[PDB]
PDB file of C-alpha atoms in Angstrom:
ATOM      1  CA  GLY A   1     202.832 -52.635 -48.528  1.00 22.91           C
ATOM      2  CA  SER A   2     200.585 -54.327 -51.085  1.00 21.80           C
ATOM      3  CA  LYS A   3     201.636 -56.702 -53.848  1.00 20.40           C
ATOM      4  CA  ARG A   4     205.361 -56.353 -53.169  1.00 18.63           C
ATOM      5  CA  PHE A   5     206.252 -59.637 -54.877  1.00 19.18           C
ATOM      6  CA  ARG A   6     206.249 -61.672 -58.087  1.00 19.27           C
ATOM      7  CA  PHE A   7     203.940 -60.147 -60.693  1.00 17.67           C
ATOM      8  CA  UNK A   8     204.386 -61.821 -64.147  1.00 19.67           C
ATOM      9  CA  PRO A   9     207.123 -60.533 -66.528  1.00 19.91           C
ATOM     10  CA  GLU A  10     207.551 -57.883 -63.838  1.00 20.67           C
ATOM     11  CA  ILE A  11     207.927 -57.814 -60.055  1.00 20.33           C
ATOM     12  CA  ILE A  12     207.699 -55.208 -57.300  1.00 16.01           C
ATOM     13  CA  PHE A  13     209.681 -55.391 -54.063  1.00 15.42           C
ATOM     14  CA  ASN A  14     210.405 -52.688 -51.489  1.00 16.44           C
ATOM     15  CA  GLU A  15     209.171 -52.748 -47.892  1.00 16.75           C
ATOM     16  CA  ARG A  16     205.870 -54.508 -47.219  1.00 14.56           C
TER      17      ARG A  16
END
């Protein structure tokens, strides 16, 4: 989707 990846103390992952 967007920034679905590592992101500092937090991360977002779920379908591009």
